[PDB]
Enzyme design. Structure first.
Site, PDB file in Angstrom:
ATOM      1  N   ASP A  75      -6.718  -2.703   8.258  1.00  0.00           N
ATOM      2  CA  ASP A  75      -6.055  -3.794   7.725  1.00  0.00           C
ATOM      3  C   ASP A  75      -5.442  -5.162   8.380  1.00  0.00           C
ATOM      4  OD1 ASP A  75      -6.718  -2.983   5.115  1.00  0.00           O
ATOM      5  OD2 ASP A  75      -4.733  -2.389   4.873  1.00  0.00           O
TER       6      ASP A  75
ATOM      7  N   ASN B 221       0.997  -1.338  -0.044  1.00  0.00           N
ATOM      8  CA  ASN B 221       0.060   0.034   0.182  1.00  0.00           C
ATOM      9  C   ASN B 221       1.027   1.219   0.032  1.00  0.00           C
ATOM     10  OD1 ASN B 221      -2.315  -1.719  -0.292  1.00  0.00           O
ATOM     11  ND2 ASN B 221      -3.099  -1.250   1.833  1.00  0.00           N
TER      12      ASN B 221
HETATM   13  C1  LIG Z   1      -7.916  -2.950   1.505  1.00  0.00           C
HETATM   14  C2  LIG Z   1      -6.886  -2.604   0.965  1.00  0.00           C
HETATM   15  O1  LIG Z   1      -6.290  -1.503   1.512  1.00  0.00           O
HETATM   16  C3  LIG Z   1      -6.943  -0.280   2.040  1.00  0.00           C
HETATM   17  C4  LIG Z   1      -6.957   0.125   3.390  1.00  0.00           C
HETATM   18  O2  LIG Z   1      -7.734  -0.657   3.911  1.00  0.00           O
HETATM   19  C5  LIG Z   1      -7.637   1.384   3.478  1.00  0.00           C
HETATM   20  C6  LIG Z   1      -7.735   1.968   5.087  1.00  0.00           C
HETATM   21  O3  LIG Z   1      -6.528   1.848   5.790  1.00  0.00           O
HETATM   22  O4  LIG Z   1      -6.730   2.339   2.790  1.00  0.00           O
HETATM   23  C7  LIG Z   1      -6.545   2.145   1.449  1.00  0.00           C
HETATM   24  O5  LIG Z   1      -7.880   2.083   0.677  1.00  0.00           O
HETATM   25  P1  LIG Z   1      -8.551   3.456   0.406  1.00  0.00           P
HETATM   26  O6  LIG Z   1      -7.591   4.467  -0.007  1.00  0.00           O
HETATM   27  O7  LIG Z   1      -9.754   3.111  -0.470  1.00  0.00           O
HETATM   28  O8  LIG Z   1      -9.162   3.700   1.828  1.00  0.00           O
HETATM   29  P2  LIG Z   1      -9.856   5.102   2.309  1.00  0.00           P
HETATM   30  O9  LIG Z   1     -10.022   5.836   1.038  1.00  0.00           O
HETATM   31  O10 LIG Z   1      -9.126   5.643   3.812  1.00  0.00           O
HETATM   32  O11 LIG Z   1     -11.398   4.494   2.750  1.00  0.00           O
HETATM   33  C8  LIG Z   1     -11.743   4.425   4.163  1.00  0.00           C
HETATM   34  C9  LIG Z   1     -13.151   4.973   4.096  1.00  0.00           C
HETATM   35  O12 LIG Z   1     -13.262   6.281   3.806  1.00  0.00           O
HETATM   36  C10 LIG Z   1     -14.424   6.037   3.051  1.00  0.00           C
HETATM   37  N1  LIG Z   1     -14.371   7.154   1.791  1.00  0.00           N
HETATM   38  C11 LIG Z   1     -13.287   7.056   1.149  1.00  0.00           C
HETATM   39  C12 LIG Z   1     -13.134   7.949   0.223  1.00  0.00           C
HETATM   40  C13 LIG Z   1     -14.016   8.820  -0.062  1.00  0.00           C
HETATM   41  O13 LIG Z   1     -14.051   9.695  -0.952  1.00  0.00           O
HETATM   42  N2  LIG Z   1     -15.227   8.787   0.592  1.00  0.00           N
HETATM   43  C14 LIG Z   1     -15.667   7.906   1.702  1.00  0.00           C
HETATM   44  O14 LIG Z   1     -16.609   7.798   2.291  1.00  0.00           O
HETATM   45  C15 LIG Z   1     -14.678   4.770   2.199  1.00  0.00           C
HETATM   46  O15 LIG Z   1     -15.965   4.137   2.038  1.00  0.00           O
HETATM   47  C16 LIG Z   1     -13.898   3.763   3.283  1.00  0.00           C
HETATM   48  O16 LIG Z   1     -14.747   3.086   3.848  1.00  0.00           O
HETATM   49  C17 LIG Z   1      -5.865   0.700   1.614  1.00  0.00           C
HETATM   50  N3  LIG Z   1      -5.564   0.532  -0.151  1.00  0.00           N
HETATM   51  C18 LIG Z   1      -4.634   0.941  -0.732  1.00  0.00           C
HETATM   52  C19 LIG Z   1      -4.302   0.544  -2.186  1.00  0.00           C
HETATM   53  O17 LIG Z   1      -3.717   1.777  -0.052  1.00  0.00           O
HETATM   54  C20 LIG Z   1      -6.216  -3.383  -0.055  1.00  0.00           C
HETATM   55  O18 LIG Z   1      -4.697  -3.702   0.095  1.00  0.00           O
HETATM   56  O19 LIG Z   1      -6.518  -3.604  -1.246  1.00  0.00           O
END
Ligand SMILES: C=C(O[C@H]1[C@H](O)[C@@H](CO)O[C@H](OP(=O)(O)OP(=O)(O)OC[C@H]2O[C@@H](n3ccc(=O)[nH]c3=O)[C@H](O)[C@@H]2O)[C@@H]1NC(C)=O)C(=O)O
Ligand SMILES: *[C@](C)(OP(=O)(O)O)C(=O)O
Ligand SMILES: [Mg+2]
Length: 422
Positions: free
Chosen positions: A309, A24
């Site tokens: 995670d 990540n």
């Molecule tokens: C599950 C994965 O890892 C995830 C990890 O669980 C999460 C949280 O720590 O942060 C990354 O996702 P992400 O960037 O989509 O996570 P976030 O954007 O923080 O989402 C967290 C929460 O905020 C909400 N959220 C996010 C963006 C947005 O515009 N609106 C919103 O409501 C989402 O629905 C979610 O429920 C990791 N992925 C990567 C590639 O960095 C994976 O490895 O595929």
């Protein structure tokens, strides 16, 4: 495809383990390479995972040359050519994280065409925060035939208040801001260690990113960025997964070069449960006496709180502790699917929406189970170590997105585990 077979019981883990570079961190770091109009960017400590291959195809599709030397764990990127605008459906539909190229595409090119992510099983996952933040920086957003079409006449600074500290949104906005005209302030920003590692790379590339790791990130836009060589931070989730494994099996494992600061809440919960966690010169050592493990309450939260995670893996550990543990998942709405599969191994759990109760000490048995997502896959494999009998874990496509040689590392620590071709 392949199956992981685990002979349960008597799998005390003892030894040392090497942890890969963070999946990540590498994904957004790869996106960032697009920003360098001069020189080449070299990422070291890159793990061999399917998500990395996809991100390499996305970046490659934007006319950046990406050369991934697998054995050397090195990715070299030449983005000095004319960068193009499209992140196609064929990649975004297999990995919604692909959209973190939106920001850097807008920074370099001034326009972007990024496939709108659809559905994902672990939760709703909207991207409103990305788009709203980009609109404040002068980006005009439309949605056309499935694609987010973004155009920035003069990408500029803005004062952005995040409703939630989105990891992805913070990354997109940070990257977009590096080449914007003006100062971008991201309030209530994601504080994850990967955010910090991204900021380190950007600054070494010539950017002016400050406050990473805090609630407020300030970026002053510059005209251009240059290549640099960056050592990807260690994968704290893989590290935490081995800490959990050691704990659940009454082991004694040294996680090499683990960063204490990157697993504070996991470690605090392991300590509260009765596990020993010790910092040594060579890494973090986890020792556990099974009979002293006591149930705990855990609530996932944005960093620096307990990471979502580590949730699934930690629930596996909760099956072995004495008493009733509680896991509250606040980050994603549907991330208890592994507990449904664990029912097949005899595990009874009581789920009330975001809260799962797990009474420790139930007698589990090996069974044929199916991975539902990346971390869930790891949780099932860990459960297989402590269940009585043979556990067969399938749908390894999920596992291969974030764990490299998991069966091999566990086998080297003493576990009866194999990866067989079906
Ligand atoms: C599950 C994965 O890892 C995830 C990890 O669980 C999460 C949280 O720590 O942060 C990354 O996702 P992400 O960037 O989509 O996570 P976030 O954007 O923080 O989402 C967290 C929460 O905020 C909400 N959220 C996010 C963006 C947005 O515009 N609106 C919103 O409501 C989402 O629905 C979610 O429920 C990791 N992925 C990567 C590639 O960095 C994976 O490895 O595929
Ligand atoms: C979820 C896990 O999203 P992603 O695969 O990361 O695009 C899914 O597809 O179920
Ligand atoms: Mg998917």
């Amino acid at each position: 495809m392949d199956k992981i077979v685990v002979q349960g019981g008597d799998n005390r883990l003892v030894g040392s383990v090497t942890i890969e570079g963070a999946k990540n961190a590498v994904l957004p770091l790869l996106a960032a390479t697009i920003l360098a109009s001069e020189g080449k960017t070299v990422l070291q400590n890159v793990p061999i995972l399917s998500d990395v291959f996809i991100m390499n195809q996305v970046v490659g599709g934007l006319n950046a040359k990406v050369d991934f030397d697998e054995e050397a764990h090195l990715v070299k990127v030449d983005a000095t050519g004319d960068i193009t605008e499209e992140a196609p459906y064929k990649y975004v539909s297999k990995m919604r994280a692909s959209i973190v190229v939106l920001g850097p595409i807008l920074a370099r090119v001034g326009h972007a065409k990024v496939s709108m992510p659809g559905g994902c099983t672990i939760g709703s996952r909207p991207i409103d925060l990305h788009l709203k933040g980009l609109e404040a920086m002068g980006v005009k957003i439309s949605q056309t035939a499935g694609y987010i079409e973004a155009k920035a006449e003069r990408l500029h600074g803005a004062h952005i208040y995040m409703d939630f500290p989105s990891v992805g949104a913070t990354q997109n906005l940070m990257m977009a801001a590096t080449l914007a005209d003006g100062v971008t302030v991201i309030e209530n920003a994601a504080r994850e260690p990967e955010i910090v590692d991204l900021a380190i790379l950007l600054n070494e590339m010539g950017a002016k990113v400050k406050g990473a790791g805090t609630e407020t990130i300030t970026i002053t836009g510059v005209e251009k960025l240059h290549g640099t060589t960056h050592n990807v931070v260690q994968d704290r989730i893989e590290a935490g997964t081995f800490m959990v494994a050691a704990a659940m099996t009454g082991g004694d494992v040294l996680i090499r070069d683990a960063v204490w600061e990157h697993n504070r809440p996991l470690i605090a919960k392991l300590l509260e449960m009765g596990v020993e966690v010790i910092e040594e010169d060579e890494g973090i050592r986890v020792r556990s006496q099974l009979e002293n493990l006591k149930a705990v309450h855990v609530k996932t939260l944005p960093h620096p709180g307990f990471p979502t995670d580590m949730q699934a893996q930690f629930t596996a550990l909760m099956t072995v502790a004495k008493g009733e543990s509680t896991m509250v998942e606040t980050v994603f709405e549907n991330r208890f699917q592994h507990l449904e599969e664990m029912r097949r191994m005899g595990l009874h759990s009581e789920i009330i929406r975001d809260t799962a109760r797990i009474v420790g000490g139930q007698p589990l048995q090996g069974a044929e189970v199916l991975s539902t997502d990346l971390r869930a896959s790891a949780a099932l494999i860990l459960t297989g170590l402590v269940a009585q009998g043979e556990t067969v874990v399938g749908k390894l496509v999920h596992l291969d997105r974030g764990y490299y040689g998991f069966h091999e590392k566990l086998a080297q620590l003493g576990a009866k585990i194999q990866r067989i071709e079906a």
